[PDB]
Amino acid sequence: EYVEMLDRLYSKLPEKGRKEGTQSLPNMIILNIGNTTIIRNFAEYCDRIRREDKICMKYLLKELAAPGNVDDKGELVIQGKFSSQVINTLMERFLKAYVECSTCKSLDTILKKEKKSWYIVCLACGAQTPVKPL
């Protein structure tokens, strides 16, 4: 519950090295004002769909059958199918993990995509990247 808030290297500021921030909890809800998807808590939101920059950005291109506008009054309006679905569906398994897999005794092991350099990092699994052969 106690989300340590330092802002120092959570996202946004391209000063990568010490600290990897933290994601889950604070205002994780887009506003959709007609195909226009205005991302309020964008700093969190980017690393709620995906921390891995490239695939995160690629998803917000591929899911956009519409010309993706960037930014309004400071807050990040994008134009396409990145409006309260997608990222929020992903945070339903990410942020809402404990209820998405409703407390399976202690071990909620059915989270994130166990493929192509993504996988799940600890928590549900004893070791990060539980790829494995059959």
Side-chain angles (χ1 to χ4, degrees):
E1 295 176 272
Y2 294 89
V3 179
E4 59 180 273
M5 39 66 184
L6 288 81
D7 188 88
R8 290 291 181 238
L9 221 171
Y10 285 52
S11 64
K12 193 178 182 66
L13 54 299
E15 198 183 325
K16 57 182 178 180
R18 278 73 280 171
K19 204 185 188 71
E20 293 170 272
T22 183
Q23 300 77 27
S24 64
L25 283 77
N27 292 36
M28 185 56 201
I29 189 160
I30 275 167
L31 182 70
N32 171 13
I33 192 69
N35 301 324
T36 45
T37 171
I38 190 158
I39 316 163
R40 57 171 296 159
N41 293 46
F42 57 84
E44 300 103 287
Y45 243 96
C46 298
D47 298 88
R48 292 280 221 281
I49 186 285
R50 201 63 263 114
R51 294 171 184 78
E52 284 64 40
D53 297 87
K54 289 184 178 183
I55 188 163
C56 181
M57 191 180 290
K58 196 175 178 62
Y59 205 159
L60 60 89
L61 184 70
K62 293 186 293 183
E63 197 66 84
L64 271 68
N69 296 86
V70 67
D71 191 33
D72 205 298
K73 299 289 183 176
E75 18 70 322
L76 279 299
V77 77
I78 274 79
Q79 207 290 270
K81 293 184 178 185
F82 249 53
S83 46
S84 305
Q85 209 272 289
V86 289
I87 314 158
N88 292 79
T89 307
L90 213 152
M91 78 77 180
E92 194 182 87
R93 67 200 297 191
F94 175 67
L95 194 162
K96 292 186 177 186
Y98 213 92
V99 70
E100 189 78 285
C101 181
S102 281
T103 183
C104 182
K105 300 182 86 292
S106 55
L107 199 68
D108 290 332
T109 321
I110 189 69
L111 303 172
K112 210 74 80 65
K113 190 180 181 178
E114 195 177 273
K115 194 58 72 287
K116 193 198 292 179
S117 295
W118 191 343
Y119 319 103
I120 202 289
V121 177
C122 65
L123 203 292
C125 58
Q128 68 300 289
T129 302
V131 59
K132 294 297 179 68
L134 56 86

